[PDB]
Amino acid sequence: QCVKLNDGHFMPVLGFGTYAPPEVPRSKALEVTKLAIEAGFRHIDSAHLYNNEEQVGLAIRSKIADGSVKREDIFYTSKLWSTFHRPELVRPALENSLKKAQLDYVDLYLIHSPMSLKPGEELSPTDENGKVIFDIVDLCTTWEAMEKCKDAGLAKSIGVSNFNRRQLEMILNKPGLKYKPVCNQVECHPYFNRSKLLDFCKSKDIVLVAYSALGSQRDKRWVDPNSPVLLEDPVLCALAKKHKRTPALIALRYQLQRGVVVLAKSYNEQRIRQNVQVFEFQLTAEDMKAIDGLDRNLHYFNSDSFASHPNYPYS
Numbered sequence: 001q002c003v004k005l006n007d008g009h010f011m012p013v014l015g016f017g018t019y020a021p022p023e024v025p026r027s028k029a030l031e032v033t034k035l036a037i038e039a040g041f042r043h044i045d046s047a048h049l050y051n052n053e054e055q056v057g058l059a060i061r062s063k064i065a066d067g068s069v070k071r072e073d074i075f076y077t078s079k080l081w082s083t084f085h086r087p088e089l090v091r092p093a094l095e096n097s098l099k100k101a102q103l104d105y106v107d108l109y110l111i112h113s114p115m116s117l118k119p120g121e122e123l124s125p126t127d128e129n130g131k132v133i134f135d136i137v138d139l140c141t142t143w144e145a146m147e148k149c150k151d152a153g154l155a156k157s158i159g160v161s162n163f164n165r166r167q168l169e170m171i172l173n174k175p176g177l178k179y180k181p182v183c184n185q186v187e188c189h190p191y192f193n194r195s196k197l198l199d200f201c202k203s204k205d206i207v208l209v210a211y212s213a214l215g216s217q218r219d220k221r222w223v224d225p226n227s228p229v230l231l232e233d234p235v236l237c238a239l240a241k242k243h244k245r246t247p248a249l250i251a252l253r254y255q256l257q258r259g260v261v262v263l264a265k266s267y268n269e270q271r272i273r274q275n276v277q278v279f280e281f282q283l284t285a286e287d288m289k290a291i292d293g294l295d296r297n298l299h300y301f302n303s304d305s306f307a308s309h310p311n312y313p314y315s
């Protein structure tokens, strides 16, 4: 139930999203990560931005101390936040994540976003008028510092997130490139299937990783409340009736059958265990076709602040 990356390492096909808005107490992240591991999740997706590596790190070590799982069985993912894009800031930001998560290494270390921000300890650098402050960093130099982390054995694999094709090509055509990004974690779901980008990554042996596969958490901070609810789609519901499954299981299985590693966030014990039921059933060739036809080029995250960034991936 794993896929081989272009560096030889293997990543579980289903991953547990660990982001919850800050209004949720951080103790929940420690509990649901235990429930997710008990339910079958081995791939755990986190980030320095999420502010939960302390809790997710303890939940991993707890379930290891239980004997329920071993560290090698767990595929931990972290992300380098935008404020730490400069080369001298990459390795310090990774070992800080390692120190907080109580880990000697991360399985996967990502560039969280190509939209560089002003360097500093603050994650949302704001100016006097409410503007988020942008920065100008050559991401090829950022990637070089990621390569030094993989050679230092602090990240078994390295990759990117929220990169478009041309932003990927910039890395792929970098003189002196030592490692290729094993993955590119982007927003992907039946409404935003990213089919064109998916064929590009497959032709370079880059694993597409779908976040907001269940249509996101719909935070009013970033999501228009008038956008359609993904899991209330008539086609996904009608397929949920046909396979006696849930609309969510249809959305996750769709990504698995098309070669996309899927993430699934949930802070409810019953919906955590229900998500691993994605391995019990299968969709026909027709049903995969029906889901492909729901595409509407709709990304649920939309903000005017980032849309003026020169590295804003969408257009």
Ligand SMILES: NC(=O)c1ccc[n+]([C@@H]2O[C@H](COP(=O)([O-])OP(=O)(O)OC[C@H]3O[C@@H](n4cnc5c(N)ncnc54)[C@H](OP(=O)(O)O)[C@@H]3O)[C@@H](O)[C@H]2O)c1
Pocket (backbone or CB within 6 Å): 016, 017, 018, 019, 020, 045, 046, 112, 161, 162, 185, 186, 210, 211, 212, 213, 214, 215, 216, 217, 231, 246, 248, 249, 263, 264, 265, 266, 267, 268, 271, 272, 274, 275
């Ligand atoms: N690289 C990036 O830039 C990036 C961006 C966004 C997200 N991510 C990662 O991807 C993960 C998932 O993305 P997301 O935050 O948008 O959440 P999501 O996977 O799209 O899920 C959306 C909502 O669906 C609910 N849910 C879970 N299982 C369900 C089920 N069987 N049936 C019905 N509803 C279910 C969950 O609510 P409940 O919690 O109440 O169960 C969840 O809030 C995140 O946690 C994060 O790790 C990465």
Ligand SMILES: CC[C@@H](C(=O)O)c1ccc(-c2cc(Cl)cc(Cl)c2)c(C(F)(F)F)c1
Pocket (backbone or CB within 6 Å): 019, 047, 049, 112, 113, 162, 222, 301, 302, 303, 306, 313
């Ligand atoms: C809050 C959750 C967080 C996570 O990583 O889970 C997250 C969600 C969405 C985005 C995002 C938003 C836009 Cl509008 C465009 C794009 Cl490309 C990406 C970002 C990012 F990358 F901006 F930081 C981060």
